[PDB]
Amino acid sequence: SIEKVPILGKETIHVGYGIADHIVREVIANLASSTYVIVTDTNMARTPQYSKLTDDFKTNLSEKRPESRLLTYCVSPGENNKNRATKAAVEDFLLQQGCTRDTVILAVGGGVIGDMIGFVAATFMRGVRVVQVPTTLLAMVDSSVGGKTAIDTPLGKNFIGAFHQPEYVFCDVSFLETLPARQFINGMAEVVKTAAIWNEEEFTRLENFSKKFLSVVTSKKPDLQSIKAELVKTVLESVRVKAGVVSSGLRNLLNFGHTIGHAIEAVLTPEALHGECVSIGMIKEAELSRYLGILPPVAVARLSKCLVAYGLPVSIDDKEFLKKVGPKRHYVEIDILLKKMIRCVLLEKIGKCYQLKAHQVSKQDLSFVLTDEVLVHPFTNPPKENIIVPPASSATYPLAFAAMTGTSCTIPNIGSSSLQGDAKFAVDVLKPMGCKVEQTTTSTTVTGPPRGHLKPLPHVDMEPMTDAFLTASVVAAVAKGGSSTSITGIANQRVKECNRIEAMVTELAKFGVPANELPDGIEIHGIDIEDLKTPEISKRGVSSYDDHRVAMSFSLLAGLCKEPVLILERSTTGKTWPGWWDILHSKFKIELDGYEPP
Amino acid sequence: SIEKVPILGKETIHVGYGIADHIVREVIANLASSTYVIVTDTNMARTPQYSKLTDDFKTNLSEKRPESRLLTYCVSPGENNKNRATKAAVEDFLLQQGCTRDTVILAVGGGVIGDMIGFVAATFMRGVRVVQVPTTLLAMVDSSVGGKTAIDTPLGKNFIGAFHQPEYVFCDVSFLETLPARQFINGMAEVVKTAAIWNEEEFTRLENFSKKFLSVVTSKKPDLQSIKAELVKTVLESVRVKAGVVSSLRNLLNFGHTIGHAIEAVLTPEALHGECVSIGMIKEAELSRYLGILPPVAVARLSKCLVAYGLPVSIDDKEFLKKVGPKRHYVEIDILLKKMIRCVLLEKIGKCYQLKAHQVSKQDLSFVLTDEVLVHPFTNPPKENIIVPPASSATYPLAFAAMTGTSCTIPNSLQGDAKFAVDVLKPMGCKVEQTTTSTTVTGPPRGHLKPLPHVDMEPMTDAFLTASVVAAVAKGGSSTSITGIANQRVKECNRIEAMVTELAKFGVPANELPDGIEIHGIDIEDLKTPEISKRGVSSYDDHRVAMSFSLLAGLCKEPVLILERSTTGKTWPGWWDILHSKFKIELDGYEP
């Protein structure tokens, strides 16, 4: 019943439930000492589990080592006690009880004890032995394993410290009974970190243990005996990940969500905890790897499912999280978060990092996932052939991108076979303006005219193409000429989420293209690719009216200007194609910047 | 040109004179860092040697690494600045300028800077690189080489600290021009330590560099250019001892640091580190002589070198007693054995015995730190012993064989006074077998000595004292009288009154015939003279009374006390080493 983990080739991380009877036997038999010190905090000093540990200690030391002492110190509670005062206070307590280099300091406590009393044990008598007894969940997973000790200067957190390996780490998970429910959700994010970088088989069990975990811990009294045998291996495989990484460039893989998370934690410092900034940072670095085309969109979501099923947040604007921060939230700008930071762990799939290393990402791609608006640079250098897979009404978007640029885009899921009517967009509304269509039975491809030689369809009616229209209006903007592009049969596009017809005639007028509202549709006139294509983003850029189709249609017209066009409400695409902007940067090589209003 | 010493396999201890040009080339080429921090002391920041170093540091960075910085801090002067305050102050200066985890800290200064700023470098960002620039002599020898860094808690000196090896130790001998003459003395003791435990060839050069060193450093201006070529190898071979020992035995560098740390903790700010180590080195060389491992010649040849450097060889030295002043009175052995037992016993000059520390008792340590001796009775001596005295001192272990019955063969007829065997021990009933060289007695079993009626010692005018204590235990009713003692009344102290005063403490009847002494005879039942009785047996500040009454003291039951133990330093300064080692007689010390 003692799950041991080998760190640096030594199984010294003992993990088990209710092992306080075993801790006392093992440490006074192997670690020989005339002096044993148990340093705690005041919260654990009044607990039944710790009075169990000291009482058993003296009634085991009196038998096996009858010329030894047990000393006991109690640090005042708080994370603000991890300073130079308490390190100097407990170091003076050991210099007045006559402690020597043989002493064994049992640092009973969470992360504030396990980092400070390990640092005390590293500097006392040029270094003595320390045995961590972690009593919080975040201490058992990350803080105790590794031997990283530090205290907190006023000018900076975790700066003055030392590397000091513990002789033994006894993660007794029966100490989790007095832990708060918010100190329990906090430490679980350092378990989802180690299952999303190393062990996908652990990540799958962390989905079935979701509401069988959270309903037990957020109860009247947390009876964790109901989840006794299951919670001892949440901590066990989280240590097997960390111990093997600190044993073997690989050690930066445990810093996933600690690049965006340490920026968020440095501006929401006492209110939001560590795991409630790591979990928000893990869901913003999984998006940085999707924007760079390394992670699939499915993983951004399957990582999001596990954090939200644990209480942990996946946005800084989550309403269960905004109550905790409150008035400290308004200091989260991308001007200050990019100064708090750029190496970051880009995931490849759930349970594996890309090339097993941290990658150098720019300040521009980080300025995109941390925002909600987008600057679309012009379409200077697209690849001339591109096979895009949309998850038909999303396929028309890169097909229209090959109509305006005049390149080639093959959507290979659908042909002239499709039951969905939105897949007809190649053969009837892009072929009139001179695009080579080669619609087969499986693929669908356009090849537009070379940069501007579009001719305006006089009149099309869209009886299958109800939500396939706004992308037909942005390709009608480029074709100048007397032929007035007019579309009818757009009757259902009035009530869905915004009246799209008024949405087009308001925003196309910002582009400098003449348009007006036909009684059942739109009348795009069309203007030359560049001559009159300049919006007024300085005042207010193109609003997408909280619709996914407006945000993606006006990103296609934005690349024919010569200065970048701002499209407000970027994240409204999350219900049809949440990574449309990832395709423009990765699959199309169009540079995208983000923007916050000043 | 720039002498380098290998430590832990690699050559990082660069010793040389005036290498401030060489330091700033090597530390900015090999140690790559956007930030170089020179933490100096306020005394060194107003010196031409340090202003040479920083101004050459900036006019070297600007050329070789143009995107790098040089930051300069100034710690307040004093050994009281080695605390948690100044460590936290300079750790806040690094967290203000924006220093990284790769910053190279050039800890310019002595041992106070070299131990604190190295400990700063160990704790700052969990370890950054440190380059020691030692500017005092004791820093170049012990403090910098080794990686031991610490600070000083109020409850104890050098307790909170860490092991942190320096990436480079640039011992510049040209930094010794501004040193005080008292800090020369201080740090010179640590170089003697390393030549008395490891290198006898270095110890002989330290004898010839005696006042060719001391007259130059104690001058109106210390022009060390005159001895520039010899100061650079005083530190070099004293580092080769330290570097090889910390590589591979490390407790051998703690010679004189067991008795010396007891002396330093009672004479703390006045006596320095070397002026208690040198007194401790000369008291652990006597602990090894008392245990019969070191020869008496070495106790003296180690004393010659330290007293020729300004360093003291006793706590009651006159130049040292002015320094400590009123704190001297707290040196009693009750508090010195509390502050201490492992100690390095030397075997000869330049070699430790069995290359390890040995566990000495609290009784043998209570002998060298005192000036009085409590002689336990002669229960179990060896039955045969060959003792080599350095005639008038050969008669003491011969008389020990007369009052016990054993056989002492002094191996070296021609000697005038060495005829104590045949004329004053033989008739009392001793088997005497004087050869051409070996002069030997073999006494009769305990008590059976019969008193010689009239034996006169005209050429043995000193032996009267030794004859008298052996005559005290002899009975038979012949009233032993030894006349013809006329020289002694003027020789040192009047020895004839000194015998009749002190034998009367022993309960033997005696008196003074007009030109001599008249010893009567009592059996083994002879009044032990303790500390209670009139202080104790007073040696009256001459070597004969201290050694003759050590022979009578073993025929009692409860240990006698002899005052002024160290009065024997003119003839046989290790007579008490022979009783414990060569004779197995337990001896312990005593203070009033």
UniProtKB/Swiss-Prot annotation, chain A:
Subunit structure: Homodimer.
Compartment annotation: Cytoplasm
Chain positions recorded as 7-phospho-2-dehydro-3-deoxy-D-arabino-heptonate binding sites: 126, 142, 148, 158, 190-193, 242, 251-255, 258, 274
The protein, known as: Pentafunctional AROM polypeptide
Active site: H262
Function description: The AROM polypeptide catalyzes 5 consecutive enzymatic reactions in prechorismate polyaromatic amino acid biosynthesis.
Organism listed in the record: Candida albicans (strain SC5314 / ATCC MYA-2876) (Yeast)
Record-listed Zn(2+) binding positions: E190, H258, H274
Region feature (3-dehydroquinate synthase): 1-363
Stretches assigned to coiled coil: none
Similarity section: In the N-terminal section; belongs to the sugar phosphate cyclases superfamily. Dehydroquinate synthase family.
Residues reported to bind NAD(+): 41-43, 79-82, 110-112, 115, 135-136, 157, 175-178, 186
